[PDB]
Amino acid sequence: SYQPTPEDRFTFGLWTVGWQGRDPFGDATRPALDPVETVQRLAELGAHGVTFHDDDLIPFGSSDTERESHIKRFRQALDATGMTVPMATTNLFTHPVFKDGGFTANDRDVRRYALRKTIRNIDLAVELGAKTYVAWGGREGAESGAAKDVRVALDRMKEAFDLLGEYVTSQGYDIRFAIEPKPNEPRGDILLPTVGHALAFIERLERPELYGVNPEVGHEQMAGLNFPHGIAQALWAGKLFHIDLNGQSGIKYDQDLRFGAGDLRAAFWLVDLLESAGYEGPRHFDFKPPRTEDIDGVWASAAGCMRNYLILKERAAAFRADPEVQEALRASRLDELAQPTAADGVQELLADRTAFEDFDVDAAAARGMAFERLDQLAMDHLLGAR
Amino acid sequence: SYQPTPEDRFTFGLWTVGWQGRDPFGDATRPALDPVETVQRLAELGAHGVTFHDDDLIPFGSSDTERESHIKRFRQALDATGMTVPMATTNLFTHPVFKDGGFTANDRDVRRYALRKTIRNIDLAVELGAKTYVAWGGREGAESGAAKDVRVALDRMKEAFDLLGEYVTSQGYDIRFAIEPKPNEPRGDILLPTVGHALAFIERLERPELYGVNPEVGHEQMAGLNFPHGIAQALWAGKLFHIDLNGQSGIKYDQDLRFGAGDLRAAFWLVDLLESAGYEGPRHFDFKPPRTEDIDGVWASAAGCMRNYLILKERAAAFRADPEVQEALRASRLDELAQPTAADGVQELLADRTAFEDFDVDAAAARGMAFERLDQLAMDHLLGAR
Amino acid sequence: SYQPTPEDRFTFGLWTVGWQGRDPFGDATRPALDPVETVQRLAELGAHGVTFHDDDLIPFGSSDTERESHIKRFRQALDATGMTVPMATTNLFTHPVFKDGGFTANDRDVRRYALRKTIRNIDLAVELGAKTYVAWGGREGAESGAAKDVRVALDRMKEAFDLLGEYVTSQGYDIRFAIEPKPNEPRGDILLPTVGHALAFIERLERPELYGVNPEVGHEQMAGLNFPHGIAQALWAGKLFHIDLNGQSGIKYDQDLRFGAGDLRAAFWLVDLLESAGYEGPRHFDFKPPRTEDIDGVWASAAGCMRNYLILKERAAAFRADPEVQEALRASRLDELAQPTAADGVQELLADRTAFEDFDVDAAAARGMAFERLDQLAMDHLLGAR
Amino acid sequence: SYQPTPEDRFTFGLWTVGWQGRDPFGDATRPALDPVETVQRLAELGAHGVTFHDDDLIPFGSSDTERESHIKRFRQALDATGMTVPMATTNLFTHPVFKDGGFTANDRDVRRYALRKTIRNIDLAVELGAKTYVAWGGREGAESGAAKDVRVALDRMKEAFDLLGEYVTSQGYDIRFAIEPKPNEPRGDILLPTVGHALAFIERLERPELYGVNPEVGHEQMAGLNFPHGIAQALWAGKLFHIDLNGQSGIKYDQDLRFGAGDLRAAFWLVDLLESAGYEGPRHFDFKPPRTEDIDGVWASAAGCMRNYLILKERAAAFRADPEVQEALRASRLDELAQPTAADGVQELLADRTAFEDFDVDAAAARGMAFERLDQLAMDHLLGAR
Numbered sequence A, B, C, D: 001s002y003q004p005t006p007e008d009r010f011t012f013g014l015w016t017v018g019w020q021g022r023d024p025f026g027d028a029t030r031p032a033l034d035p036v037e038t039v040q041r042l043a044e045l046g047a048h049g050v051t052f053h054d055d056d057l058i059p060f061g062s063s064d065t066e067r068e069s070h071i072k073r074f075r076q077a078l079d080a081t082g083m084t085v086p087m088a089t090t091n092l093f094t095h096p097v098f099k100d101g102g103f104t105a106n107d108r109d110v111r112r113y114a115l116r117k118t119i120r121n122i123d124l125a126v127e128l129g130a131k132t133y134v135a136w137g138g139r140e141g142a143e144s145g146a147a148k149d150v151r152v153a154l155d156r157m158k159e160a161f162d163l164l165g166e167y168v169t170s171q172g173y174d175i176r177f178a179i180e181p182k183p184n185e186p187r188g189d190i191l192l193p194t195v196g197h198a199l200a201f202i203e204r205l206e207r208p209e210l211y212g213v214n215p216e217v218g219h220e221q222m223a224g225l226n227f228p229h230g231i232a233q234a235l236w237a238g239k240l241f242h243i244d245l246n247g248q249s250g251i252k253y254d255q256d257l258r259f260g261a262g263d264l265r266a267a268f269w270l271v272d273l274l275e276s277a278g279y280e281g282p283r284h285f286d287f288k289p290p291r292t293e294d295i296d297g298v299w300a301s302a303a304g305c306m307r308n309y310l311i312l313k314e315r316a317a318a319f320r321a322d323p324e325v326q327e328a329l330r331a332s333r334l335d336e337l338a339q340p341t342a343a344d345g346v347q348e349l350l351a352d353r354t355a356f357e358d359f360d361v362d363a364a365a366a367r368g369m370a371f372e373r374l375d376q377l378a379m380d381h382l383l384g385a386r
């Protein structure tokens, strides 16, 4: 039961299971993992593919010979296992040069370097099959108010993304960009801190159709937001190009717990939404096996991400298929929410005395929404106690 | 010193100083205020104008004769004092009929009522001179996951705002809408929870030019976000149609403290930004005098909102005018942030070896940003210890 | 399955199911409930008892004749159903007189009134059978820094609790006090904001044995704290005299969702802890049926509180009984945590070279904790997918 | 103006200005600092002393010869500058051996090692003059619910602290312990997460008089708590043995901004409280110069910590000395808060009809607290606009 296979589209970053366990107050607890080992182990667990930052695959500062070698061993592992690479990204955050940003660094020469580093890796991503290229502007932001003029920084961010869009267009590449929001950490405040801010920004790019979001469960939860709601807004906009699945225990540092951990009911509602919307993209885990774990715990935690998705998928499907739930949804007027409010138009609404002058507000007010009964059916289904 | 006059554009909602002090665990501590008294007292304190919900000005359920009477006394007070009404809004949250929303109520008849209630008050707002009409969807959202299908709710929200835009267009009215985000309270999660989400949503309306945001200091801070940053993004988008100024002590219930209270340095950076951007709109306070206060404390707290703005304006101006600060800004490369990254374009960037192959990442990395010295000049200016 | 009976010790405040739905932005959505109706309906659902504030049972300002009448009808309902009253409390928060506090009001005459109001209700509580008397100092605190000298306020709080302890001692009453922490709301910050602060304060009372805590799930979660951990510390101290069970969706206003809602895995770990510790007190729900609900939804939500406890109890028991979990606990050294570190004492520890000079830190470091496998067994048990 | 000198008691950890800038997503941005250089630079800035973890002063794993060398160079620098060492602590968090804790590690051999490591450094601390020995249990806690039995962990924590108290007592050392709370990070939840929880725990130690708290501004703010209030409770308990001063911008990762940054008004109220209470201990900064900074920015940020304390001290003194503020305090009944509520005792209170039967609740309720006027005087003083 609940055994993943490649059909389930589960993917993992090299940096997830490969995290050595260094944290702000601690040294590594595990050795570096060879990307080849990660591809093989994830394939054996039932994954569909892996993702990478440039610098996870090729050590920063590698010579061209070393680069080619690292790429060849990785491609051979992919080819041997049938593992795919649906997404890639750039590391614009680890090296000290990026201490004030990549695309929005105050130093212009750093901004140009950030773009060149990104473009090099776009070319590699395309060759390996990535259809989405993620940008996580983790260093874009500030600890203090005058350090960053945010309007001007947004000009530089737009310029950078427009330059990347011109590049991909000129090369004829079939790849799209996905902006991954995060509200803070490692900057005191990060630019484009939520799904909303990223969606809004995209609409001022030159070629908005080339850009979407890569929301992460834990990141929206670091702002105390409802992740399923934000995903719904991204889906409504047509912009859910990729997703990062994990867990987070509230408003704190970015934990990157395995999926299912943290806010379990939000994980349930997320899976319910992805499945009923027909999301077709990768089910990507951006998680960290806690540094308490040895390598065997790394693979257990990775397996748990997939298992939890599959359990939740089963429970959500059972919830929506239950005739008692379909009745409760009617009792709560979820069907009526889908009716247009005023397809008859403004003049007909204005002339309709049943909408105002003769509307019995007290009788309407007295009608309960029946949401608690509906939610307890949902609880029962999640818990297998339906 | 720091004496407000109407030239300063300070405005207040009737419901601010008029708050009787009822909270989730407490009865009223002050009597209801007559709108006429509020207009006169605010005028004497140096305010420029007032704002209202329909139901603050005219008691809900008033007959047409009573309505006209309430409106006439208010207009006479405005006319006598020279107080203006730059903004108005609808109460789509107090009456029990709105328990599941106005525009996104699951019951269709409630959605239609919400629109009619809004349209009636738009007509009044225009007559009184409001150029901005605020929508705060405080009841739009959910406590539980299946209660609200958010994609469908967003369809209903869009339909409602598009209907209002068709109405104002057909009447030829010179008024614009401003959506006021809030992340939660009184719903467990509110739709369009931040400035970003509201900006994003606007871009999918039929007539996006008619809609902007009315961000509130405390509301973005209820998500732990940086209010000056969010205002910067709204300004960058051309969408800061109005603002609500107040204070908030962290991630908790909506406090609506007087402006300056709560996060004082964020208040400083906000004023710095509004003044350097040339924001021309009302400086509107959406605050609650704490229920500890009697009527004399109400007016003290209102006066304090204005005084704090004026003090912060002076300090921010002194900061930006100080030659030592202008040097520190250069030292921190704020000037260089404004240079285009690659106006030379993609081919020139790709051919520029100084951007990649020959870029000395370590020398760049070693250069300090000097942000702490800059921020301590800012601190010194705020504290008057420059 | 999961049918509550009085043996399960479930109790509810009159103010829970009796909440009329007034919130900071909304009028009542339900009529007032007669306490007699609440006793009868809860008894039919399988509850064991009810709790009350003075002013829930007897309207504030009732004459002595009216008081006696309200008490008699309630006692007759209790007597008819076999419902108990294990806890009572005072309302020191609704009336405007308490706007700056009860026991720590700056006005001395208010502090004295608060004590008299409390003592009157202690006498009633004892007659009705309450063994715990809760104090929730919801108005004790401040919105601003100089309004409340906290050291002096703590002196007044101690004086009040010591006076109450002298009263109960002199009357020979068998009742204990339980302080209910909350971090904020309705005050900007509330004194004794967490379980820890309340436990600490108790140790400086004259008769500390008479005082414990009444922690509430949602209140500790309003500080982002781990409720099971705080309960563990209260149990460790011998101070878990009562508990309030509910749900909360993060760091925000006090939601008082039904138990099980909000942080579901924290609800699981809480039940696991209460059951393995042998907590014998009431399983009391301090919740609000959302104001979306009519009366039928009130009773559904109340029933859901009890059902969720019972489901979680079953899952937690199954988890701890599973041989695979008992093995995983050993693999993770939970057994070894219970061994004394150094029962051999300080001189033997200092002379033990295996504790320092000859301790192989790297071999110890390399041993994984196996916590992820353990936690995934816990997840599987919660979800019924063991 | 605002020039620190040793008389001001300012101290800094070696790890503060010595932070190399590694964060969870970034490599070091600055070179390691020699402790000798730190002592000399801080002395030149006007500091009084420095603090250390064992492993900041002596590299982990140093041979006895290397240890003695590191200690000698440091003592020579101290001796040359007149810099003191008022506090020391153990690093029980960086090495991978401590991945599940020191004193509460599930592995018993790790717990014993943690104690030996601590005892070795106590002996050094005493020699160097430390009068306070801090314990920060940053690894004590869990990411998952079954990983740590908190009651049993508290038994192990108590055992460890009792063993340390027996050791210091047997050696005759004049040193006290201070527990530094933090709610989370690097563990998902940390044991003893707040000042309150630590104060409570101390009262169950064998020799409670030997233990107090070392609260940190940012740590209490990571739980959204009021730091001045928590300090007031620690002072009220007689347990403020040391303090860590810094800044924090809300509920997020531990930022360790320079003091004054983050919540500026809380910094003001903190200084007001420390000065009026007569706190005599070190004014210790536990801060991180942001990794954006080079070495010159390190010393600017360190200097800014001290400058901000001194500015705030001046403003707080001016506030309390202002006759207008002393009148406002009376208007707000801060004087009356200091009067005993019922020194006349319980029988006299019960017989006093002015406390209940004849108390005019409405007249009392109608009296405003005048807190807003008081707080605006405080604002004016902070801003130098009095």
Ligand SMILES: OC[C@H]1O[C@H](O)[C@H](O)[C@@H](O)[C@@H]1O
Pocket (backbone or CB within 6 Å): A015, A089, A134, A135, A136, A138, A180, A216, A244, A286, D025
């Ligand atoms: O962009 C891919 C990844 O970059 C970094 O690893 C971020 O920490 C992570 O959240 C993001 O998903």
Ligand SMILES: OC[C@H]1O[C@H](O)[C@H](O)[C@@H](O)[C@@H]1O
Pocket (backbone or CB within 6 Å): B015, B089, B134, B135, B136, B138, B180, B216, B244, B286, C025
């Ligand atoms: O929309 C105007 C106002 O409506 C309500 O009063 C909200 O509480 C407030 O935040 C909003 O600004």
Ligand SMILES: OC[C@H]1O[C@H](O)[C@H](O)[C@@H](O)[C@@H]1O
Pocket (backbone or CB within 6 Å): B025, C015, C089, C134, C135, C136, C138, C180, C216, C244, C286
């Ligand atoms: O003290 C009993 C109750 O008083 C109030 O109703 C509080 O809101 C609640 O949290 C508390 O449990």
Ligand SMILES: OC[C@H]1O[C@H](O)[C@H](O)[C@@H](O)[C@@H]1O
Pocket (backbone or CB within 6 Å): A025, D015, D089, D134, D135, D136, D138, D180, D216, D244, D286
């Ligand atoms: O215990 C002294 C220090 O140990 C670590 O450096 C912690 O991060 C810090 O908060 C604490 O004060």
Ligand SMILES: [Mn+2]
Pocket (backbone or CB within 6 Å): A216, A218, A219, A254, A255, A256, A286
């Ligand atoms: Mn993350």
Ligand SMILES: [Mn+2]
Pocket (backbone or CB within 6 Å): A180, A216, A244, A286
């Ligand atoms: Mn991610």
Ligand SMILES: [Mn+2]
Pocket (backbone or CB within 6 Å): B216, B218, B219, B254, B255, B256, B286
């Ligand atoms: Mn507000």
Ligand SMILES: [Mn+2]
Pocket (backbone or CB within 6 Å): B180, B216, B244, B286
């Ligand atoms: Mn507002």
Ligand SMILES: [Mn+2]
Pocket (backbone or CB within 6 Å): C216, C218, C219, C254, C255, C256, C286
């Ligand atoms: Mn509550």
Ligand SMILES: [Mn+2]
Pocket (backbone or CB within 6 Å): C180, C216, C244, C286
């Ligand atoms: Mn409660």
Ligand SMILES: [Mn+2]
Pocket (backbone or CB within 6 Å): D216, D218, D219, D254, D255, D256, D286
């Ligand atoms: Mn810290």
Ligand SMILES: [Mn+2]
Pocket (backbone or CB within 6 Å): D180, D216, D244, D286
């Ligand atoms: Mn610290």
Ligand code: NA
Pocket (backbone or CB within 6 Å): A035, A056, A057, A058, A059, A070, A071, A074
């Ligand atoms: Na590689």
Ligand code: NA
Pocket (backbone or CB within 6 Å): A161, A162, A163, A165, A166, A205, A206, A207, A208, A210
């Ligand atoms: Na573009």
Ligand code: NA
Pocket (backbone or CB within 6 Å): B035, B056, B057, B058, B059, B070, B071, B074
């Ligand atoms: Na009126």
Ligand code: NA
Pocket (backbone or CB within 6 Å): B161, B162, B163, B165, B166, B205, B206, B207, B208, B210
């Ligand atoms: Na439109």
